[PDB]
Design a protein around this ligand. Sequence first.
Ligand code: HEM
Ligand code: HEM
Ligand code: NA
Ligand code: NA
Lengths: 713, 713
Amino acid sequence: GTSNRDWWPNQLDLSILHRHSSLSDPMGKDFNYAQAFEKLDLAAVKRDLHALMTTSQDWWPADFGHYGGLFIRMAWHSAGTYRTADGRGGAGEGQQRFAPLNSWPDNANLDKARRLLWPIKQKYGRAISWADLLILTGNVALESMGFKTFGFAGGRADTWEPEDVYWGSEKIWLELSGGPNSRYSGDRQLENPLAAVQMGLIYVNPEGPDGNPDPVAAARDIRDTFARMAMNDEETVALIAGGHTFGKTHGAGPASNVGAEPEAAGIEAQGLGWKSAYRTGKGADAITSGLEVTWTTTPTQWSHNFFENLFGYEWELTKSPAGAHQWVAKGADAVIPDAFDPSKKHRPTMLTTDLSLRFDPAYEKISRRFHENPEQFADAFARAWFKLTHRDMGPRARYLGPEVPAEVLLWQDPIPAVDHPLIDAADAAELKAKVLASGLTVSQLVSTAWAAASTFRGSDKRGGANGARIRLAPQKDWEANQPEQLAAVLETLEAIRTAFNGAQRGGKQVSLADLIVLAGCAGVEQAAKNAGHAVTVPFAPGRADASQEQTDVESMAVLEPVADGFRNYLKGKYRVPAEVLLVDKAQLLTLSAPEMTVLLGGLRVLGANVGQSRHGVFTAREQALTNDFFVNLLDMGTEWKPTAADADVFEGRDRATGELKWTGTRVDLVFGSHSQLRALAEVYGSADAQEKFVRDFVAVWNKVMNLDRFDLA
Amino acid sequence: GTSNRDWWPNQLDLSILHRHSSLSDPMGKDFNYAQAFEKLDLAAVKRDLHALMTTSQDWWPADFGHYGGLFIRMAWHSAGTYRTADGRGGAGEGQQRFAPLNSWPDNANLDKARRLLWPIKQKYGRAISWADLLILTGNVALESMGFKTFGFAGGRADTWEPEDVYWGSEKIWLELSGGPNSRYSGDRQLENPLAAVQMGLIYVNPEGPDGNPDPVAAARDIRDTFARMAMNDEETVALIAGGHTFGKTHGAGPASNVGAEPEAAGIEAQGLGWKSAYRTGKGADAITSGLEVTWTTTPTQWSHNFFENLFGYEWELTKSPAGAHQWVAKGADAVIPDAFDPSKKHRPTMLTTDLSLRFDPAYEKISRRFHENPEQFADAFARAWFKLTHRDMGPRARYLGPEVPAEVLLWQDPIPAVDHPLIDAADAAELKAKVLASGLTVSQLVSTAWAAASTFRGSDKRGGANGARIRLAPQKDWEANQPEQLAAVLETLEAIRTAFNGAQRGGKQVSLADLIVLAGCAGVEQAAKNAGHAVTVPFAPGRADASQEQTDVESMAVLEPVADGFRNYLKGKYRVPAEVLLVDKAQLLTLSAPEMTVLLGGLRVLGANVGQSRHGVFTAREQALTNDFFVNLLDMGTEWKPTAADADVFEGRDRATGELKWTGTRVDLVFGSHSQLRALAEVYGSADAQEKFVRDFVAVWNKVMNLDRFDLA
Ligand code: HEM
Ligand code: HEM
Ligand code: NA
Ligand code: NA
């Protein structure tokens, strides 16, 4: 059936803002996963997972009698889709069980791993999500094999449909770089926001870059991709060597034996895929990646044998039975056990990417240290494993259950505990009046609070106004935040704060984080009043102020908004049209299309644009909260044309006189062009809509102010 | 950006079940359009519409100084997408303003007509939907030009995103038949559910079939398409001749002058399209279809000149200025006025499809009768216009406002007014006990109520249990309804009814319609009791029994469920896979995926399958309401394979012994295959879900029983 996507393949797609509706959700509207999980008998679940590790099923026999390696790989791929650039991917929503990730080539046979878990999932039901189970199972695997984890948090709620993620533009799975949809340009520059070298891989090609078995070159891809998943060199080495302490790869026969991935398989395969015509098709004959490497002499026990082997032998380039490049230890004895035949042993083997850990000079140093001091290796790996598997979970307030580690880690963007009474409704009305009496304008107040709150992204639950990190490096210096103007607003607000806090009893005080948001609330209330409306903007206190020392400046760089359509801002020129960047930002803020529409139309007339740009400011009463954006945008008496100077800026002229009335960007005019957005703009641009516009604006403003408020969940 | 649709273009699409969520809706949850409309000052709206008719805008000047003809076309296209096969299309959701219909070639320049209405839409706001406005405008245009309409009903609620409709498989706009995705096969057989001859046309090609200007052959397409939009020969003739009493076509210059349709146009076009480089691009130079025909001597007034011209001249084949085939009156004077230049007149002209009304023999007779008896033409056209523009509105109880015609028409599937007291809760308990004491089984009770209620479709709001039409021709004879078994259940229910009604006082009685539904409710209660649960199923009385004479047997044929996955029924072999037909049926029933899932798993174990097929009956306690379907479907101890005899039937065997445990169809197994459906099945197949299964099943059962209950809405 031909679809709108077929006819108009470059039209903006709004359906990403309307996923995860209550329609698609099988749980009741009141279902609260955290409360279900808090009553889970986690210990009982872990005992069952422990038994499962050594209970082989005949439909996918356990290598060495132990599923531990398979489940570690399962949990590392669940987490390993994560990208720091947008926060999308990762383990936090259990997306491995949906398309496309369930059918990526790098996820081959993890369908088997998930199916082995069904009996436990079924036993415990809604009290443990798939998302949480995947990770837990990886932890229990590590534990069953002698490795002490750093901890575990539950609370990843299950999702019920595929997430909309840009994974690349290639039309061919695993396409080598340099094709018509190359993810690479320049000197091997991987396009943002991607974090894998080929479509359908987690990070890198285990044979080497585009299949070239050079460990030195492979190290460069490893460092790049892993950095793009928020891991530095120490973490990266700890993770790869840690992981490859266990289990094995599967390449027993030619890859052409392997059938359709799960989304393409026949209905009778019942959600499984990669059915193999090679011999028994499983167990000793398994084919997964096409490589056939077993790293250690005890694949089902934690050890330091990965680095003993890596450094203790010289390595020779060879081929697996499927024809993949891989490496074998020169002159070695047959010391590695066979996965199924107790009478066979094999020589030590490695992947090209394993050898990177020795032949890249910076890795080599860390690898040597870990070799010489395997207790440091153990600790770095435990920490990296926790980070990897929790990096997208958000603030510590979301962490559930009895195994949460008490140590606070810098990567968590931590927020200190609140240890004093909070302001009440009377205090909030007093602080709003002081803020307005200071002479800060509607536009400054709205802009500052917008800047603080709108760093939130729902993809990994980073950012937001909690912490008052806007006052710290690097936020205070981002161009979108107008550093000079921001500093003056913050200095006035801090004097207000100091005077309020100095006047209190019983330890009551207000944080700057809370006051920045509250002051924005006063902006919006005043703007409403300037328009003849009496409204109270809701406000919830309880934010706390983080220090500079609790704020990793490099990790915060990925939250910089290089595009923010809500402030009509684009830092440079990109290949993605600005309206597409608007919808992307809306999705990260968890907004629907109506919310995005209302929000943007309001922000325009409040003066939230960066640099005081008049683009899209379609009102003659700036700083009054009215629906003027929509009434004026939709006025057919105005005709619009791209300017000579800039095709992305448009002049709106009176159709009869030619007089210049307004200017706007693509982000402004999309609301009068796109047929679905214009239908929304019509609702708010109607003569009966001013009260609705004000109410809906205040609601979405409050929603944005609270996005990171998991302490109130 | 490569999507799941790109990777797996034949995968079932569930997102059609989760369209129109509260996420995409700009109105509050509680917005009730009927109530807004009932307060609209309709008289004031119609005054404003009357003024608009002759208020020419320079950006799209009015032909002859009067937009009436353009607005009639605009309303007839709004309505004219309707297909009787599925009820999809029509005017009832205002979908002309969304993709793809906003940009179909047959809808060219109706973007201008809709933009002309914006100031009125804006003025009256949510109190009049676009959907209602487009139709009302067509009525007002007719009225402004001297034609008395049969009436008007409001109540078409606006929608906020494109409807999911199969419009064809062609990848080229207007593709002629016989291409790789031909909608035609055999002796010009149009595939169901399509009701147009080319992709992007309303009904037929105005030049003739595939562009061949044979009026007789064109008549065959007109009769077939129009029958597929629920119109017979008399209605068809009255509509085409009525419509083409007004206005003109637009073909002043070559079509290559005309640019991008709205969805492809630049952002500066602000939602409009087909911008033309021919001369002024509008008014006297307008190009819309490429034809250049003005039918009557008074294009802005109702007249009887269409048929005078059609029969009064002989016609000669010629070409418009754009090169299109069209007809000119042999030897005629220049009597037709020019749309802009008072000093020009033109000869009478016609389309090939107009000439069909004279050269098809069956049409010719109607056309003559209308020519000789103009009052019959007038009345037939008024009636057919009301029908065309209300055919997808559903039962009369949804009709709003002061112009609703009092006459009840056969095509409305009318239901008599209730004129007696209704049964109360005591009476319902008494009737349920009688139904259970009669010996009717759970399977009979459920199957019959399912059969009665599940004819509803939300596309045009036809069908459902009201009316008790299951007891009449043709429903009583449909194979999916099991005529013999249905008759025995109905006869028992009717004796129950007779004895209950014979015992009452005042005039209380129960309808058969109500008793069929109630009896189904008792079945579900009994099934629940068979499983150890104490459940009361909600029931709302007030359905009435329609007569045979109130039930058009031909128009009812399109509600026959040739595919009903809920009863594991497929009447023949189709080119669409059965799981796709299941999702299609669920959409028409207004079900979400979780609802479809729960519903189907329950029906299977209650014995609702046609013919007592054991396919999907995965339980050893049939007629007990349990989640066995899910627990057994997801049991990995069973392996499935398509049978040798039939690739659409699967055998589920013990993995260890090879013993046969079950059989199933594609509809059954899809719930264990598709990754989103399987996620849903997991919820209901978990150990904690038997109570949630039972309660969600009752809720969705009740929902289906009430789909048509607009008397309670
Ligand atoms: C440069 C990074 C990495 C590459 C190229 C890589 C590559 C691979 C490949 C190709 C396989 C074999 C799949 C098969 O045929 O079954 C595999 C297995 C495995 N990897 Fe990795 N990997 C990397 C990092 C990691 C990390 C970070 C972890 C976990 C901390 C991990 C844990 C595992 C485990 C446990 C297995 C064994 C699976 C089994 O026993 O079935 N790997 N790896
Ligand atoms: C065989 C069925 C029909 C065919 C092929 C057909 C075809 C067309 C075409 C090609 C145009 C010219 C479009 C343009 O260039 O502007 C048109 C105009 C129009 N049609 Fe039809 N028509 C059909 C039936 C109807 C019906 C059922 C109605 C209304 C009851 C209707 C009312 C009109 C009106 C009022 C116009 C004039 C538009 C204007 O003045 O701007 N037609 N028709
Ligand atoms: Na994420
Ligand atoms: Na419809």
